[model samples]
Target chain A: DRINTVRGPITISEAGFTLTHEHICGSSAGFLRAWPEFFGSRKALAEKAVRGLRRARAAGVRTIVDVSTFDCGRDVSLLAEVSRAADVHIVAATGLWVDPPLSMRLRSVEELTQFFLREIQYGIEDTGIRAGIIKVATTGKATPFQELVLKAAARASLATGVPVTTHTAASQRDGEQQAAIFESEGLSPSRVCIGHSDDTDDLSYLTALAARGYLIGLDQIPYSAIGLEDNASASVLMGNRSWQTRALLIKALIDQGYMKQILVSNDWLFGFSLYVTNIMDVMDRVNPDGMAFIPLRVIPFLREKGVPQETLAGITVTNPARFLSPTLR
Target chain B: DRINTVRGPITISEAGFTLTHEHICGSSAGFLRAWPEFFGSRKALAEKAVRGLRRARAAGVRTIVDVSTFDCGRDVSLLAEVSRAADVHIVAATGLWVDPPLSMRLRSVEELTQFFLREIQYGIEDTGIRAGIIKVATTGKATPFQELVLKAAARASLATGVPVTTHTAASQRDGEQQAAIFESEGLSPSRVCIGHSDDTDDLSYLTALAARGYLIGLDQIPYSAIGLEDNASASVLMGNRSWQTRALLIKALIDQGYMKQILVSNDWLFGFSLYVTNIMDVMDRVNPDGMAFIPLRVIPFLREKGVPQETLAGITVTNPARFLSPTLR
Candidate 1:
């Protein structure tokens, strides 16, 4: 049963190397900010996300966290179909990001938390996909509203045993404070994957948080970072450096003793443009592995640099598997 | 002396709060590429750049530099008129951005340097505004060609006695490479500002560049942020923190008295509206200083946080003044 009369419980377990914090079909932050008129209907977007959904599957990306909301035209039916074809674990969301104007809903955080709990306990069994995570973007400030958002995410994550990942400011001070709020609300730090940290230049800050047990997200690969083009690390990742750096950053986190605390995703969405995506498409092939940044030519460099084969395997698959295992390996 | 042959040299002295690096008018990037048929004629761009000069003057901007060049449809007459109307100094560039098809016109760095020298000394003279700086870009890689470009830029600066700055890299690696090359070429580190360091998460990179005697260009401001966004310590600025922290970051390099090396600009272009300048229009307003986080706001924040009064003054006026000044501070 659901609040909007949405119903059912859903299960997700397969698709090798489940990308727990990844996305299939979702609303875009850029669209949320600049193109509201375009999202007048969620069905259209749902269909689009579903198409991109299977694309991830074809590329061997097994599972995704489809976080677009229902009102934003996120149809569960679409997600389910895409998930079936891709045979990917496509988990959906039950929450918010930065109020409305994007979702056109202004429900409070507490209210949204309840909605999420209901979705997880049951499902959109009749309506759509089950909620796996609750998403919210903080203002990088612990303003009352943002705090309430943290409270809501904490409640949902704690109640459902599902994780919560935020939008843009997902990696900055915003996420740090959210984690603080989440911990105070009794949610494990291990349950959240702070997104957009790729935009952040502060590895130490991220390492510190990872030390505290939160999953540090290095999503938006070969894409931008904090200041739009701020993803220098992504460039590093897009080149031969991705595998090494991926292993290195994760290793540093693990060496710092937070091996179980890392997450990765190619968070591109339907809200992208041809000019941007066109460049991305080409870079996808030229840069390392499907945007992993160690173009085929650089494997030897990794070896030369002393990134052990075991370390590479862990970063490429094992570590990711552990993070997405739902068991937080 | 140069590109102003058809025009008259536009004096840039009245300007204290000047925008050293900005697009007053036009682009060869889009129009010249995908829509040459629909694109405005080169002369039209010259006309538009003139309008921006007027609009900038009306906007209280003291001085403005137009970096348009061969690849970008450089125009001296329009620049001269705008400078004359605004009663502001208009410094234009003698070099070019690395736009393809046109970049093909630049056979080699030697030819490119000759073109730049001709513009500065002999004047694109037919158009009038004096050439002030050398403009170029790197693909975040220090290719031999990029190295040659730097060599030319260095030679041009030394020859023409003008300061030089370059288009920045989102990753900043390119800027650092350019700095090293410039230093290797015997150019004083004082004459260069690696533009666009704010687009990365690498504060340390910017600081390192700063340490090497270069200025940090944080021109793009406060846009890309939500309401009441943070700028004082943006990762783009130096990693998210307080003004005191960034001031110290900036000051550490500058405090040993590298103060003259940190230049700032809003990098704004006027009238770039969909109805006004289109996407470029929105880009021009990215910082929204007029709305929030402009010099008026930034200065006060810097002052309150123990940024020395002279330092604060340099950020707004002197640093920029000296950055593009004919004589080094």
Candidate 2:
């Protein structure tokens, strides 16, 4: 039941945790800025993120798989150095982001199988920076590019024998495609985890995916959000959303015996303290009144429900480690 | 002509000043959090907002056009207090947001128009709480709902003789459809200011809108964006998409005899500072040498280029006052 946390094969404590989807410190391609512009370069980005990471560490987040893809601004050299400096395992991947209105070409589906293999090859070579899992991002709809992404993911699994994790298109279809693709690839459905699944309220979907085999990720934590960018921030009214909604959803799904396939993470993108989740301001919701006094809101609620340490271990450690194992080949 | 400042029937000093489209203080129904989920009442909301306004004051902001509309959580009581406390003139608004997506039929177009007239009538009832202008929000796509809104706006203008401002969906047909509706409403095109007009990089589109007697608004400063989510954020990485592009387009429009149509302001939604428009960091790019050292950026540049204090005054004071005032009926 013990989960191993390692940075380049170095054994870490039980408190050491590995985050499959994270951004250690990098800005988007300055392509889109809201309030503050081009905040800082990779160094500046890393500096800003370091403070947050320290907070994460205080709350037991040790290793992070930083996946700010090229379209999202892939920081290479700086990330490698950041990995060493933060002492937090920074797992960077070579892939493209699939949001909408823009298509980032990383390796064609035809070439992606080999592309992941190459990325795994070179990344492991570069300071032994290993890609913990085959990372592929998705859009809301199944674009031709996403189809290719699945194929490449399948091929990578077949070749490297490493499991894969996908960034689901937030709200709509995190599970459907992940399940279909894994089945088609002849890989065990248990080898996959669909990222950003908490954006939706469909418990049946989460339970069904978990029952069928795939891991469901709720990384972007909003005590009140349907998911970050999922419910459309502008429309999500304050107080209309709450952590209990999140806790209740997880509790309901876990009660249905889906905890084994669940993963929880904080997609901490902002530096501010109080934030809105679902549709409400989570500050008070997560604090004294309801959710509980904690550094991170969701984790404790899951723990409170008597979910096994092994399940938590599996999600935070075992799954990530097993998914990224180089020897899986 | 010195501006009356309209801090509600009081005129203040008018010098080289800037008015970012803002509200003195208000809440939004869309951002309303469920009780026990976020802040409880307007009192809690205003308390947090006062801190921000105080910070804004220290930052050297002058007059601010408080554009909190009726449907949004318009707390006029709080506005008066915040204005007095912040020592700023707060221009409140009277208008309805466009209809919702479901087309849930309520009032007819004429009814909505009359409703706006009534809201404005009650606003400046000599109760010491006076709205500076009339405002409208639109998708800028000329929907039936938008047509209705435009009709109502025109009627309200006929009754109040106040200038009207509108919210145009950015990164979309901001200038085209919205302008068409105003033109069809028989409202003076010079009286309408298109909010979020800067969301697109299409100079031709902006030019056309400016040409049609509408003041093009390019106020949302983008830092990091993806699509509709972090869109402005994405544009920031592309290049210098600041007031330079905005001024260039405005200048071209002015040269085309649209001079009387120009009104400058910053359109900011209150309470949410997680916005992408907080790009004060890039002001240098707009100033000489792309560096923001005092008396440099576009605001001052507009003055240096002989943009005339009167024209600037129109944007800052006269045009806005004219848009929000009632006729001598």
lDDT of 2 by residue, B113-195 (tens): 65566555554323445454667776636666667777787778766666677777666775566666666766776667777
**Second chain alone, TM-score for each candidate:** 0.73, 0.68
- Residue B269 of model 2 has an lDDT of 34
TM-score per candidate for chain A alone: 0.68, 0.74
Score each candidate by Cα lDDT.
0.54, 0.52
Estimated TM-score per prediction? 0.41, 0.43
In order of listing, the candidates' clash counts read: 44, 59
Q: Any runs in candidate 1 off by more than 4 Å, and if so which?
A: A1-329, B1-15, B29-60, B102-106, B170-172, B223-257, B271-277, B284-294, B304-309, B327-329
Deviation (Å) of B135 in candidate 2: 37
Candidate 1's residue-wise lDDT over B1-329, tens digit each? 12121234433344466666665544432222211112243345445555555554555556656766544544455566556644666677766565423122323666557656766775553333357777877766866666666788888887766877787665637877788788787888788878765556566677777777787776554434332254332223223333333333444455555566666555555322111213443443344343123355555665666677777666657776666656532
Reference contacts preserved by each model = 0.00, 0.00
**Interface Cα RMSD, each model:** 19.0, 19.1
lDDT of 2 at A28: 34
